[PDB]
Nucleic acid binder design. Structure first.
Length: 749
DNA sequence: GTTCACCAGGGTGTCGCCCTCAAAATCC
DNA sequence: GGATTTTG
RNA sequence: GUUAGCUGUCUCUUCGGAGGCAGAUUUACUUUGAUUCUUUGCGCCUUUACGUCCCACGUAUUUGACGCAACUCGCGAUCGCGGGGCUGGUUUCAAAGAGGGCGACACCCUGGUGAAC
C-alpha cells in the first residue's frame, strides 16, 4: 500500500522484463543536516567562510554588472564563448572568469582558490540562464510593443478622434536591437500613464463605456542581472520610521502657509474630506474642535490638530524606543499617525486641484510610509550555498581532486555507525585514501571509510567510467580538514546510505555526484544559523519495459477534490472508483484566510504560515502518488492523466521502477504515454454524460453524480478512443467522432 | 459602498533557466 | 609534494 | 513512534499460504494528516472600543511589546551557555521528501489620488 511497497511491487515486473535498452540514470539528493547542536564550534567557522564567499561574490558581481552595463555584446561574447568562438583566447565562460578573477587578480583573494573557483563555476551557469531568458523574453516584449503601436494608430486614436477626447502623449521607443532595461522602464511608465487616462476618460465616463478602451499592454518579463534583487539593501524598520518622521514634520512645517490663504470653497472642501483609525480619529477631533471653537480661523485648527497628532507620535515612538520595534500594533499606529499628519498638512494643495504639485509633494511621504509598512512584514530568510565540485581522485593516487569527502566510521556494533563530512578550506588541510598498511609521510590514519569517485570524465577521449571508490582515510597531521557531523533520519539512511540493495559500503549502485554546503539564516542575525549538506547521488534504474496492459487507471484533477480515480479494464467497464484528499481545498482555504487576516490585523504572519501552503502541496502530491501507485500496482495498470508536482512525482516514481523514460535531450515535448504514464487532451471529458454521453447533473437524461469521479472515468474510457482513431496535426476538433465512438461502445456494451 | 485605473511598499507560490568533474601540465 | 592553472 | 522486503509465535486449519500479535528494520533531517491531556504569571508601556476632544486621567477583563521569575527542553561543567510557551507543548497513531542558484510572473495585505456606479 505504501509508495515504497507498491514501488517494489512494480519493480517485481519492471526489472522482471527482457529489454535491450540501456539503463537510465536518476539524480537524487540526500540533504543531510550539519549537527551544529552537538558541535557548535563550527558555527563561527562556517559563518566566516560563507562571509568570505559572499564578499567575493558581491565583488565579482560588481565588476560583472559594470561590464554588462558598459557594453552588452562583449558580455554576451564572454558568457557564450565556445572552442569555436573563443573570447580572449578562452573557450568557456568559466575559464575566462577563472583567469580574470584569480590568475590575473591583483590583491590576494580572502577566499581559498577551490571555493572561489566553484563560485565562478556556479556563476557561469547563472549568467548563461540570464542571457537565455533575455533571448526568450525579447520576442514576446517586441510582440507587445508592436501590438501597442498598431493599437495607437487606428483603434485608440480613431476612438478618441471620433469621440472628441484629446489624445494623451505618444509611446516612447525601445531600441530593440541592443535591448536595455531603462528603455523598457520608460515605455512601461508611459503604458501606465495612458492606461490610467483610458479608464477614466472612456470606461469610467465622458466616453463610450467599452471595457477594452484599447488599454495598451505592459512589456513584461525582462530579467534582472544576477543578484540585482538578491543584494538590494533595505533599511531597518527604525530607519524607515525616522525617514517617515522627518518627512511628515517637513510637510507640517509648511502647513500654516497653506492654511493662511484658504478660500471659503476650499475650506468647505477640506471640511468635507474630514467629515465623519488615524484618519477617522483625526476627523472626530476635527468635528470636536469645529463645534467647540466656531470663533477660530482654519489655521489655528490645523495647527492644534497637527500638534495633537505629533504628540501622539511622541508617545508612540517613546514606547517604541523603550520597548523595541517588535510591538507591531504600536508601529502600525505610529506609521498611520505620520501618514495622517502629512495627509492633513498637504490637504489644501489636493483640495485646490493642483494634483501635479500634490503628487511631487507627497512622493517623500509616499515612499517613506511604503517603506515602513513593507518592513512591518517579516523578511524572507537568507540562503547561501557553497559547492564541492567533485569527489574524484588523482589517478593512481587516491589523492583528492577537490576539498570534500563523505566519511563513515563503521563500528563493530550493528546499530552504531557514524557519518560525517570532511571539508578543506584553510591552508594545509589534506586528506587521502590509502590502505592501512600503505604508510604515508606527514599523514595520520583514521577509522573513517571515505567515498570518493574514479572516472566519469566528460572529455570524449578522457571519458573513463565513473566508479564508487572507497578506502581508508589519511588526514594531514599539522592541519587536518574540518569535520561536519551529520543528522539525517532512518528513512533517509535506509534509502541512500544502507539500502538493502545499494549499501554504500558493500554495493556499487550509487555514485557520488557533488556536494553543497548550505546556510539558512534570518537576515541580520548569523548566530542562529542552520547548516545543511546536500550530496547528489546517481544510479542506474531498470531499462523501460514493453507492457501489454489489460487494465488502465484514469485520474482527473483541478476541482475541490485534487484527484479522483476510476479503475477500468481493457474493455472500459468500471472496476472501482474513489477520491483522494477531499479536505485539501478546504484546509488550504482556511490557511489562506488566516494569512489574509494576519496581514490585515498586524501586517504579516510570523512563524509557519509562511511555508505551510507549500508543505501542504508537497503532502498532497505524496498522497495522490501513493493512491495512484497502489491502484496501478494492484491492477498492473498504466495511469491516464490530462494534459504539475503530482505529474512529476508520478513519472519519477514510474521511471525509478523502469516503467517511464526520463526526458531525452532536446525533445521538449513529452511522449503522451511512456510506460504507465499516459497523457490525453482534457477535451470533451468532464462534459459528456456518463450514462449517455453529451456535482454533475446531465440534461439529456437527468443523471446526477460526482463531477470528479465521472470525469476520471471518462478520461480512462477516452484513452481507449484514440486507439482506433489516431489524431493528426492541424486537426483538433473531433467531437462528432468521439461521441459516435462513445455511443457505439455504449450500445455494444 | 463597491469597481476600475494609476502610484508606493512588502509577503508568498509557481515557473524559467540554470547546474549536480575529471584530469593534465606547470610552478614554488 | 603540494599548489596553481587551464580545459573539455 | 511508524510510513523495509525480517524474525518469533497464535490461529485460520486438511487446500493454497493467510490474517492477528510481538519485537526488527543503524540517526536523531525537512514536512503532511488525524488524535489524548494541558491555556505560565507579576510588573512597565502600548493597541481596538466608551466617555472627552488630543496629551492626560478613568474604565473593558480589548490587541500586543519589553523586563523578572515558574516551567519545559538542548548544551557543557551545584552552576553556566542557548531555545519555546497556543501559529504551542504533549500522548497515541498513519503517511511523504532531489536539491541548489538567480530571476520573472501571479496573487494577497496596507496606504494614496481620481473617477464611475
Amino acid at each position: 500500500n505504501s509508495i515504497h511497497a507498491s514501488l517494489r511491487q512494480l519493480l517485481a515486473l519492471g526489472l522482471s522484463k527482457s529489454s535491450s535498452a540501456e539503463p537510465q540514470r536518476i539524480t537524487r539528493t540526500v540533504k543531510f543536516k550539519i549537527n551544529t547542536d552537538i558541535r557548535p564550534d563550527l558555527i563561527p567557522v562556517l559563518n566566516r567562510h560563507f562571509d568570505f564567499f559572499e564578499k567575493f561574490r558581491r565583488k565579482v558581481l560588481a565588476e560583472l554588472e559594470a561590464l554588462w552595463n558598459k557594453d552588452q555584446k562583449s558580455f554576451q561574447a564572454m558568457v557564450q564563448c565556445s572552442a569555436k568562438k573563443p573570447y580572449q583566447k578562452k573557450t568557456s565562460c568559466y575559464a575566462w572568469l577563472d583567469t580574470h578573477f584569480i590568475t590575473e587578480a591583483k590583491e590576494s583573494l580572502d577566499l581559498p582558490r577551490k571555493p572561489a573557483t566553484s563560485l565562478l563555476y556556479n556563476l557561469s551557469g547563472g549568467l548563461k540562464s540570464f542571457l537565455t531568458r533575455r533571448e526568450t523574453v525579447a520576442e514576446d516584449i517586441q510582440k507587445r510593443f508592436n501590438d501597442n503601436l498598431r493599437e495607437w494608430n487606428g483603434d485608440l486614436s480613431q476612438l478618441a478622434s471620433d469621440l472628441k477626447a484629446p489624445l494623451p502623449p505618444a509611446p516612447p521607443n525601445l531600441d530593440f536591437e541592443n535591448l536595455i532595461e531603462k528603455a523598457i522602464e520608460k515605455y512601461n511608465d508611459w503604458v501606465g500613464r495612458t492606461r490610467a487616462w483610458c479608464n477614466l476618460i472612456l470606461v469610467q465616463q465622458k466616453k463610450v463605456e467599452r471595457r477594452d478602451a484599447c488599454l495598451p499592454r505592459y512589456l513584461k518579463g525582462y530579467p534582472g542581472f544576477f543578484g540585482s534583487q538578491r543584494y538590494a539593501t533595505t533599511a531597518g524598520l527604525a530607519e524607515n520610521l525616522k525617514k517617515l518622521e522627518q518627512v511628515a514634520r517637513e510637510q507640517s512645517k509648511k502647513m500654516p502657509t497653506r492654511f493662511a490663504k484658504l478660500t471659503p470653497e476650499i475650506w468647505t472642501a477640506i471640511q468635507e474630506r474630514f467629515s465623519p483609525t488615524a484618519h477617522q480619529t483625526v476627523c472626530l477631533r476635527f468635528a470636536a474642535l469645529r463645534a467647540a471653537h466656531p470663533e477660530w480661523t482654519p489655521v489655528q485648527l490645523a495647527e492644534e490638530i497637527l500638534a495633537g497628532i505629533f504628540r501622539g507620535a511622541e508617545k508612540l515612538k517613546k514606547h517604541l524606543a523603550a520597548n523595541g520595534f517588535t510591538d507591531r500594533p504600536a508601529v502600525i499606529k505610529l506609521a498611520n499617525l505620520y501618514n495622517v499628519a502629512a495627509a492633513f498638512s498637504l490637504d489644501p494643495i489636493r483640495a485646490a486641484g493642483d494634483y501635479i504639485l500634490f503628487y511631487e509633494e507627497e512622493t517623500p511621504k509616499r515612499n517613506a510610509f511604503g517603506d515602513v509598512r513593507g518592513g512591518l512584514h517579516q523578511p524572507s530568510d537568507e540562503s547561501a550555498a557553497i559547492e564541492i565540485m567533485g569527489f574524484g581522485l588523482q589517478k593512481e593516487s587516491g589523492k583528492p581532486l577537490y576539498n570534500g569527502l563523505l566519511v563513515c566510521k563503521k563500528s563493530e556494533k550493528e546499530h552504531d555507525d557514524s557519518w560525517a563530512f570532511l571539508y578543506c578550506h584553510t591552508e594545509g588541510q589534506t586528506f587521502e585514501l590509502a590502505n592501512e598498511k600503505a604508510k604515508l609521510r606527514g599523514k595520520l590514519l583514521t577509522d573513517w571509510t571515505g567515498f570518493a569517485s574514479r572516472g566519469g570524465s566528460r572529455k570524449k577521449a578522457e571519458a573513463s567510467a565513473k566508479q564508487l571508490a572507497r578506502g581508508r582515510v589519511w588526514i594531514s597531521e599539522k592541519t587536518p580538514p574540518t569535520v561536519l557531523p551529520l543528522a539525517f533520519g532512518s528513512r533517509q539512511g535506509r534509502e541512500y546510505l544502507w539500502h538493502f540493495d545499494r549499501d554504500l559500503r558493500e554495493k556499487n549502485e550509487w555514485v557520488l555526484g557533488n556536494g553543497r554546503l548550505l546556510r539558512i539564516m534570518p537576515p541580520g542575525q548569523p548566530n542562529a544559523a542552520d547548516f545543511y549538506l546536500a550530496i547528489t547521488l546517481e544510479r542506474q534504474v531498470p531499462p523501460l519495459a514493453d507492457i501489454k496492459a489489460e487494465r488502465f487507471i484514469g485520474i482527473a484533477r483541478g476541482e475541490a477534490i485534487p484527484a479522483a480515480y476510476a479503475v477500468i479494464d481493457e474493455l472500459g467497464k468500471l472496476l472501482a472508483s474513489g477520491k483522494i484528499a477531499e479536505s485539501y481545498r478546504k484546509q488550504q482555504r482556511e490557511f489562506n484566510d488566516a494569512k489574509r487576516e494576519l496581514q490585515r490585523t498586524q501586517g504579516g504572519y510570523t512563524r509557519w504560515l509562511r511555508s505551510k501552503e507549500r508543505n501542504r502541496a508537497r503532502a498532497l502530491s505524496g498522497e495522490v502518488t501513493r493512491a495512484v501507485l497502489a491502484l496501478a500496482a494492484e491492477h498492473r495498470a498504466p495511469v491516464v492523466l490530462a494534459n504539475q508536482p503530482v505529474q512529476r512525482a508520478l513519472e519519477q516514481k514510474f521511471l525509478e521502477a523502469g516503467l517511464w523514460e526520463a526526458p531525452k535531450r532536446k525533445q521538449k515535448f513529452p511522449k503522451k504515454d511512456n510506460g504507465f504514464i499516459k497523457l490525453i487532451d482534457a477535451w470533451w471529458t468532464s462534459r459528456t454524460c456518463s450514462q449517455c454521453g453529451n456535482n454533475f447533473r446531465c440534461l439529456k437524461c437527468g443523471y446526477e453524480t460526482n463531477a470528479a469521479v465521472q470525469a476520471a472515468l471518462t478520461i480512462a474510457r477516452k484513452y481507449l478512443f484514440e486507439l482506433e482513431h489516431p489524431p493528426k496535426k492541424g486537426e483538433k476538433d473531433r467531437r462528432l467522432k468521439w461521441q459516435a465512438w462513445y455511443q457505439e461502445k455504449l450500445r455494444t456494451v
